[PDB]
Amino acid sequence: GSLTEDGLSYKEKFVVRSYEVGSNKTATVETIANLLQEVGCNHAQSVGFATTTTMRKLHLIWVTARMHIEIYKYPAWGDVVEIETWCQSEGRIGTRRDWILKDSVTGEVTGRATSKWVMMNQDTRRLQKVSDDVRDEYLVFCPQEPRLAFPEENNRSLKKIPKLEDPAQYSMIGLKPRRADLDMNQHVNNVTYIGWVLESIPQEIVDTHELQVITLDYRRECQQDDVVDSLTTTTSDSQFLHLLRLSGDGQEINRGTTLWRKK
Amino acid sequence: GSLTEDGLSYKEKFVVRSYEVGSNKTATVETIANLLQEVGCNHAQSVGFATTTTMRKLHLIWVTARMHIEIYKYPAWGDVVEIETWCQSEGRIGTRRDWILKDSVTGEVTGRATSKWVMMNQDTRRLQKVSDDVRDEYLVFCPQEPRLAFPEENNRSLKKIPKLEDPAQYSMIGLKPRRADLDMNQHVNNVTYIGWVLESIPQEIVDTHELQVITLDYRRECQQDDVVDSLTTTTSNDSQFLHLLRLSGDGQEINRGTTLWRKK
Ligand SMILES: CS(=O)(=O)NC1CCCC1
Ligand SMILES: CS(=O)(=O)NC1CCCC1
């Protein structure tokens, strides 16, 4: 791909692969989430990055706090999808990365995503506000006027998510990451949590419904030697409340909501 | 990609992605195996397929019996890899698909693969020899003279694999497939078995060695509701292992294999 003419956003085209599609021969939400991750990485590399020069010496990293994806049409196997991505400063709270998914042939928006990132010390795992020294290093790569993939005042991407009460209606227990679930730094890839959340959705729902919206809050990281329980309860179109927690102590790692539409 | 000038092989270029690399910032063997699978699919689509018209009528499918991969250099993140693939008839035994991996910049062969496919009834799971009616439908898309990715007279792609004896030196217990491990037909993707085999290799070996060769025999398919046990034993500068995947319950064999690793 490449940066746009103003250098304030990045675009990339992807051809949907055979192993990237589900039973309906269209890209899975995990394939979509991997593509957003890839275009985000290519945007950082194209402008020299993410971690700025100040973040590196201070052992600071950007970590995902919240992910929100809305899909209107899942691209078919062999189709070309164009993804446009950009970043925006959210003051001292952190940063935001947005995405727009379009069909390469028709030019219509087939999906959109937004994510909230927060600064964290790599070693102590302690959150912190964005300093001016850090802010000045990345602002020159962001639009200065607001540019939101989800502009709607009071919309699905900023709603509070409650904690699922025991007993859960559905559950998938004993989930463990394998080496394919780890990134280049040996941490569990954020897309694996989406897959784990979806494992407790019954197969009948997956077979008769399509996933329209998914919102995920990231509370704690899952280590390579950790075991996760996936819990789901219907709250309703079908809506579900989700919870990932450690198999042992029951420590929360994620919470989320999904909205599905009848095929 | 596209078929070559003679239409007897297919080539495709891939840029290695961020989430496709391991700790060394190079493509994993599972990424490589997915790319071979994708180029094989695009080859069949480009010539009108890989079930023929007769195979669809008789509920017959091509299933993998053996996979053999040898990697000399794993492509780095952001690198372009070119993969050339072709098929060859192995008489009435079945078919073979071979691959050649090359660096797009240097043009050098960085890896190669071969696989044995056998005809099976989709419903009864019963193997069968390739009939003349089926053979004539795909022969016109194959080279007639032999073209082997592993030509050597004493190559490791045709060696017999023994069954691992209990107790195993290493093991990874309770492995279950998730929805991302399934293909478009809701069957476990063949690349998941490679990942499962590698889960019983200790992390220290993965951190100090690079995987050079992997040979896998496919004996039985793992269902979506099955649980697998991965067993490994060292048999050996270079390290060799004997592998076995079996069902967690009854201990029914699903796969057996061997891996060869070299010191980084
Ligand atoms: C514009 S960018 O996403 O490539 N760079 C990042 C912005 C937040 C910190 C670095
Ligand atoms: C050209 S191809 O790879 O699609 N040929 C195949 C041989 C087995 C059946 C199809």
Side-chain angles (χ1 to χ4, degrees), chain A residues 159-171 197-198 200-202 213-217 230-236 238-244 252 254-260:
Chain A
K159 192 148 47 259
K160 197 64 190 68
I161 305 169
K163 198 176 186 164
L164 187 151
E165 303 199 349
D166 272 359
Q169 180 175 26
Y170 305 114
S171 77
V197 158
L198 297 179
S200 59
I201 291 287
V213 190
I214 179 167
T215 309
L216 224 57
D217 277 342
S230 184
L231 314 169
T232 300
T233 295
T234 309
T235 65
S236 46
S238 294
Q239 280 211 44
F240 301 88
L241 181 56
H242 301 277
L243 175 79
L244 296 192
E252 183 184 341
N254 289 80
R255 66 172 73 174
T257 51
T258 59
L259 171 70
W260 301 69

Side-chain angles (χ1 to χ4, degrees), chain A residues 24-203:
Chain A
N24 30 23
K25 293 162 183 167
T26 63
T28 66
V29 83
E30 284 176 85
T31 288
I32 297 301
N34 271 332
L35 296 185
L36 304 179
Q37 188 213 134
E38 170 68 1
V39 73
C41 271
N42 293 335
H43 182 197
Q45 289 176 112
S46 75
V47 294
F49 284 103
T51 72
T52 73
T53 54
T54 301
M55 294 189 214
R56 275 137 169 246
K57 43 174 268 289
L58 245 47
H59 278 51
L60 266 19
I61 55 172
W62 287 113
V63 93
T64 309
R66 165 94 147 223
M67 177 64 127
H68 181 77
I69 306 173
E70 287 193 2
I71 305 297
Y72 315 117
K73 206 181 279 196
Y74 285 91
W77 163 29
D79 282 13
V80 186
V81 55
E82 197 180 45
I83 305 170
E84 190 185 22
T85 188
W86 71 94
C87 293
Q88 278 224 310
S89 172
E90 298 212 315
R92 297 171 64 89
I93 303 275
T95 255
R96 192 187 78 252
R97 173 171 293 277
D98 283 13
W99 298 256
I100 297 295
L101 288 91
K102 285 184 176 175
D103 189 357
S104 263
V105 181
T106 70
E108 74 199 40
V109 172
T110 54
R112 51 171 178 170
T114 185
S115 71
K116 312 285 213 169
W117 299 74
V118 291
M119 274 195 70
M120 183 188 277
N121 184 289
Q122 204 164 207
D123 313 310
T124 65
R125 307 209 243 258
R126 301 183 94 240
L127 292 317
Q128 75 162 85
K129 302 243 201 264
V130 183
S131 66
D132 294 8
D133 283 347
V134 163
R135 207 118 52 82
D136 292 6
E137 288 169 316
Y138 70 79
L139 236 214
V140 298
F141 306 107
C142 299
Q144 310 289 287
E145 300 173 333
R147 193 198 169 184
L148 324 181
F150 294 85
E152 320 103 77
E153 221 180 334
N154 269 349
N155 76 277
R156 300 186 178 123
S157 71
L158 312 173
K159 192 148 47 259
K160 197 64 190 68
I161 305 169
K163 198 176 186 164
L164 187 151
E165 303 199 349
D166 272 359
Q169 180 175 26
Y170 305 114
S171 77
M172 176 57 75
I173 76 165
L175 298 167
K176 298 196 297 188
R178 51 186 185 95
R179 287 193 189 102
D181 294 307
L182 305 175
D183 64 7
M184 61 188 82
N185 311 128
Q186 306 187 262
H187 293 262
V188 173
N189 188 295
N190 72 150
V191 178
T192 305
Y193 300 102
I194 297 173
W196 285 342
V197 158
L198 297 179
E199 274 302 289
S200 59
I201 291 287
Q203 191 60 52

Side-chain angles (χ1 to χ4, degrees), chain B residues 40 43-44 47 49-52 55 62 86-87 95 97 138 141-142:
Chain B
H43 182 196
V47 293
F49 293 91
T51 62
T52 75
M55 287 171 64
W62 287 113
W86 70 94
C87 304
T95 55
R97 172 171 294 276
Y138 70 79
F141 306 107
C142 299

Side-chain angles (χ1 to χ4, degrees), chain B residues 164-175:
Chain B
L164 187 151
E165 302 205 342
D166 272 358
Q169 180 175 26
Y170 305 114
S171 76
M172 176 57 75
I173 307 313
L175 297 167

Side-chain angles (χ1 to χ4, degrees), chain A residues 18 30 38 178-179 198, chain B residues 18 30 38 178-179 198:
Chain A
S18 47
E30 284 176 85
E38 170 68 1
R178 51 186 185 95
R179 287 193 189 102
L198 297 179
Chain B
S18 46
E30 285 176 85
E38 171 67 1
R178 51 186 184 95
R179 287 195 191 102
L198 297 179

Side-chain angles (χ1 to χ4, degrees), chain B:
Chain B
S2 184
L3 292 160
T4 57
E5 198 86 295
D6 58 6
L8 301 175
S9 80
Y10 190 93
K11 291 174 173 187
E12 191 169 352
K13 288 178 213 172
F14 299 95
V15 173
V16 181
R17 301 180 178 162
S18 46
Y19 63 88
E20 290 181 330
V21 303
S23 62
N24 301 134
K25 293 161 182 162
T26 63
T28 66
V29 82
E30 285 176 85
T31 289
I32 297 302
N34 272 331
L35 296 185
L36 304 179
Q37 186 171 247
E38 171 67 1
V39 76
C41 279
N42 292 336
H43 182 196
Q45 289 177 255
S46 71
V47 293
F49 293 91
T51 62
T52 75
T53 321
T54 301
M55 287 171 64
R56 271 176 266 104
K57 167 196 184 302
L58 307 181
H59 280 50
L60 297 176
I61 56 173
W62 287 113
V63 289
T64 308
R66 180 182 271 211
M67 178 63 127
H68 181 78
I69 306 172
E70 176 164 30
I71 305 298
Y72 315 118
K73 206 181 276 197
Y74 284 96
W77 164 29
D79 282 14
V80 186
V81 55
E82 196 180 45
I83 305 171
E84 191 185 22
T85 188
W86 70 94
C87 304
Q88 277 224 310
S89 172
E90 298 212 315
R92 306 188 74 99
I93 302 178
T95 55
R96 192 187 78 252
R97 172 171 294 276
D98 289 8
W99 297 256
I100 297 295
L101 289 94
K102 285 184 176 174
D103 189 357
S104 262
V105 181
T106 71
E108 74 199 43
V109 171
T110 54
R112 52 176 185 167
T114 185
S115 71
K116 313 284 211 166
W117 299 74
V118 291
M119 273 197 344
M120 184 183 88
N121 184 289
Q122 205 164 349
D123 313 310
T124 65
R125 262 66 232 272
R126 300 182 61 80
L127 288 231
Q128 75 163 84
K129 304 263 98 175
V130 184
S131 66
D132 291 16
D133 283 347
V134 163
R135 231 158 60 183
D136 292 6
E137 287 170 306
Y138 70 79
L139 246 173
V140 298
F141 306 107
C142 299
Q144 310 289 106
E145 303 153 15
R147 194 198 169 184
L148 323 179
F150 295 84
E152 318 103 76
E153 297 178 355
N154 291 129
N155 75 109
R156 10 174 87 108
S157 71
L158 312 174
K159 228 133 61 188
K160 194 64 184 292
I161 306 169
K163 198 176 185 164
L164 187 151
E165 302 205 342
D166 272 358
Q169 180 175 26
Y170 305 114
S171 76
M172 176 57 75
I173 307 313
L175 297 167
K176 298 195 297 178
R178 51 186 184 95
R179 287 195 191 102
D181 295 307
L182 305 175
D183 65 7
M184 61 187 87
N185 310 128
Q186 305 188 261
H187 294 261
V188 174
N189 188 285
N190 288 330
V191 177
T192 306
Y193 300 102
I194 297 172
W196 285 341
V197 159
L198 297 179
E199 274 302 290
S200 59
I201 291 288
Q203 191 61 52
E204 315 95 82
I205 292 299
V206 173
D207 291 335
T208 64
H209 293 77
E210 271 232 291
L211 181 67
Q212 241 214 85
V213 191
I214 179 167
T215 308
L216 224 56
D217 277 342
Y218 292 82
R219 192 185 201 87
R220 204 163 289 264
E221 177 185 323
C222 169
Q223 257 80 280
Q224 192 193 148
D225 61 347
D226 278 345
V227 181
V228 167
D229 289 349
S230 185
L231 314 169
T232 297
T233 295
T234 309
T235 65
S236 47
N237 266 60
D238 281 0
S239 295
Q240 280 210 45
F241 301 87
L242 181 56
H243 301 278
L244 175 79
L245 294 193
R246 68 180 185 202
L247 294 181
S248 234
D250 63 3
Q252 179 111 67
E253 183 185 341
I254 73 165
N255 289 81
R256 65 172 73 176
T258 50
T259 59
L260 171 70
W261 301 70
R262 86 173 302 119
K263 276 189 63 172
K264 292 176 185 179

